[PDB]
């Protein structure tokens, strides 16, 4: 065999402890670069001028953060959507001041995660499985793209991408509410139904299967020892599971087809999360949540407030305070 | 018009309130709009010279048509709600406006996204079907059962 | 793909119960604290540094400014029984907005 | 940063005590007649 043929055989081998694959060839170096830069920046990066106003924000542990407050901070508003690799900087000091790590991290991460999704297709093909696990992963992948790429594009700056940190994520969420009234957007509402529903059906399915395990163990043993990896027979009684759930609601509300059941478990959170991602990705172009501010008016013309108007008051607080030194003109237009 | 010397007006942060430099030195508008200095449009280019925005042209040459256009475009920024209340998210009801640009960008992002998913769905399926396992794993011939253990 | 996998179907299904059930229970404990205003509102070390050092800023201090906006702008209409009147001049606001 | 002077011991014992409990249990399971 050729040197190239042996290598292709190794790359695509079903017997590597971790599958490599052609997507893997791009995924591995890009994820490693993103990870290494993330960890060093989260520990040791100096403050970053995120809003391009020479007001640098400290994200790293060594510069006074803890796990909760720390972040890799987004690149400068002065940069906008300009591509800012290390070699476009005069020095590493400049690159650090201006939030260069954030760009390096997000772009390698998004490439490496896109290749993760391809890799899931690829291994399924090598193993003779059906191909759509990668389709379920496209839901969280699309959401990462929404916050790190599509939102910045729409708003004209990576300074508005989600920060890589826990408190920074909350900052992103609060400003987003103020600027898009995302709570009042039906795609975010579908997102919530997707993740609350996902959690509800997760608990439901787990409890129903666990409820109907076939007795294979004594009282002093974990029931988990009643199942052996790779056994042919099913380990629970789906008829008993269905008999319980059908009576809990009514017979027709219950699945006794395990394939339909497992399809539903996939589809509900995946579709809801696609809609969450499309919420962020379309609020990116400022088509925003429902606005019922002063929608209700009395016979004279007095505004009669509703809960929408109370939401609006909270949003105003967020709006007027955020980036308190950045706006010189009366409208925040991006 | 009120008398401000816009070229020398320092804003709260130290950057120019109206005018500042891009990272490569061009004179550009200040405030958050520093991110939008790549923008080019016919109402604005008359004010631009080799250095960027030209303070002399700004002082002497801004026509009323340019003023009109800037006011019109500022007040038709592509922000508005799903029910077509134009303005920022805290705006009161009054103006029925969502920009055609927001309509067309949002719709096509949504369509382009679902089309990527359709691509993955059909590409995966066409590989599985061409190889003969799109209906599931042959119980009598399960490929993984013939592979060595990982560990 | 991921380095680890379930091998035990019973454990897999018990974990599906465990995860979201435990999460909701933890969130409930936090809300029982909030009943008493026993919040995780602040990090004291952050506030001591920020008070002494006007160039020190983190996402944590940025969020508190947003909270202060929320309380001042929302409280008069949201808590009518308080009869709050906050003159324009006392409202926290950044530049221009 | 003027952190709480008990935060280090609290974190350390938080980690150590339950981790040691699990390690004790795991090793004595391994040493059982297989």
């Amino acid at each position: 065999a050729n040197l190239w043929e042996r290598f292709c055989n190794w790359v695509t081998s079903t017997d590597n402890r971790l599958y490599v694959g052609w997507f893997g060839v791009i995924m591995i170096p890009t994820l490693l670069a993103a990870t290494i830069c993330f960890v060093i920046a989260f520990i040791a990066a100096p403050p970053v001028d995120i809003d391009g106003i020479r007001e640098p924000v400290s994200g790293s542990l060594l510069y006074g953060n803890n796990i909760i407050t720390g972040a890799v901070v987004p690149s400068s508003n002065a940069i906008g959507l300009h591509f800012y690799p290390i070699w476009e900087a005069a020095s590493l000091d400049e690159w650090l001041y201006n939030g260069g790590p954030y760009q390096l991290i997000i772009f390698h991460f998004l490439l490496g995660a896109s290749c993760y999704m391809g890799r899931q297709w690829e291994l399924s093909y090598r193993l003779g499985m059906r191909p759509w696990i990668c389709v379920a992963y496209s839901a969280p992948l699309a959401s990462a793209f929404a916050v790190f790429l599509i939102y910045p594009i729409g708003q004209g700056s990576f300074s508005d991408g989600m920060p890589l940190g826990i408190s920074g994520t909350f900052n992103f969420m609060i400003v987003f509410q103020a600027e898009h009234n995302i709570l009042m957007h039906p795609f975010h509402q579908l997102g919530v139904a997707g993740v609350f529903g996902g959690a509800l059906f997760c608990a439901m399915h787990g409890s129903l299967v666990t409820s109907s395990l076939i007795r294979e163990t004594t009282e002093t043993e974990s029931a988990n020892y009643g199942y052996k990896f790779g056994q042919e027979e099913e380990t629970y009684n789906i008829v008993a599971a269905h008999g319980y759930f059908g009576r809990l609601i009514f017979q027709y509300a219950s699945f006794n087809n395990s394939r339909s059941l497992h399809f539903f478990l996939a589809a509900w959170p995946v579709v809801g999360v696609w809609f969450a991602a499309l919420g962020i990705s379309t609020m990116a172009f400022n088509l925003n949540g429902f606005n019922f501010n002063h929608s209700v008016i009395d016979a004279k013309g007095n505004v009669i407030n509703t809960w929408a108007d109370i939401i609006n008051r909270a949003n105003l607080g967020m709006e007027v305070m955020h980036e308190r030194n950045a706006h010189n003109f009366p409208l925040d237009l991006a | 018009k009120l008398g401000a010397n816009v070229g020398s007006a320092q804003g709260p942060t130290g950057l120019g309130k109206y005018l500042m430099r891009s990272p490569t030195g061009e004179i550009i508008f200040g405030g958050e709009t520093m991110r939008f200095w790549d923008f080019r449009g016919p109402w604005l280019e008359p004010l631009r010279g080799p250095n960027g925005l030209d303070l002399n042209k700004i002082k002497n040459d801004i026509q009323p048509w340019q003023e009109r256009r800037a006011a019109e475009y500022m007040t038709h920024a592509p922000l508005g709600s799903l029910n077509s209340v134009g303005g920022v998210a805290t705006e009161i009801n009054s103006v029925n406006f969502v920009s055609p640009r927001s309509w067309l960008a949002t719709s096509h992002f949504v369509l382009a996204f679902f089309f990527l998913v359709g691509h993955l769905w059909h590409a995966g399926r066409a590989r599985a079907a061409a190889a003969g396992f799109e209906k599931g794993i042959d119980r009598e011939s399960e490929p993984v059962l013939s592979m060595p253990s990982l560990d | 793909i991921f380095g680890i996998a379930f091998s035990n179907k019973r454990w897999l299904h018990f974990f599906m119960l465990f995860v979201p059930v435990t999460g909701l229970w933890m969130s409930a404990i936090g809300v029982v604290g909030l009943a008493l205003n026993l919040r995780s509102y602040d990090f004291i070390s952050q506030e001591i540094r920020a008070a002494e050092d006007p160039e020190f800023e983190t996402f944590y201090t940025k969020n508190l400014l947003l909270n202060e906006g929320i309380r001042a702008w929302m409280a008069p209409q949201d808590q009518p029984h308080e009869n709050f009147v906050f003159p324009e001049e006392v409202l926290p606001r950044g530049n221009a907005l | 940063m003027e952190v709480n002077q008990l935060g280090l011991i609290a974190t350390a014992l938080f980690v150590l005590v339950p981790s040691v409990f699990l390690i004790i249990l795991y090793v004595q399971t391994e040493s059982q007649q297989k």
Partner: peptide
Amino acid sequence: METITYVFIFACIIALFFFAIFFREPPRIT
């Protein structure tokens, strides 16, 4: 001291990932 603590815990977690993947209890069909 806090930074050391946070990085230590993090480092231990990465160590755990390594042992959990490469020194796992191997899945065996019986």
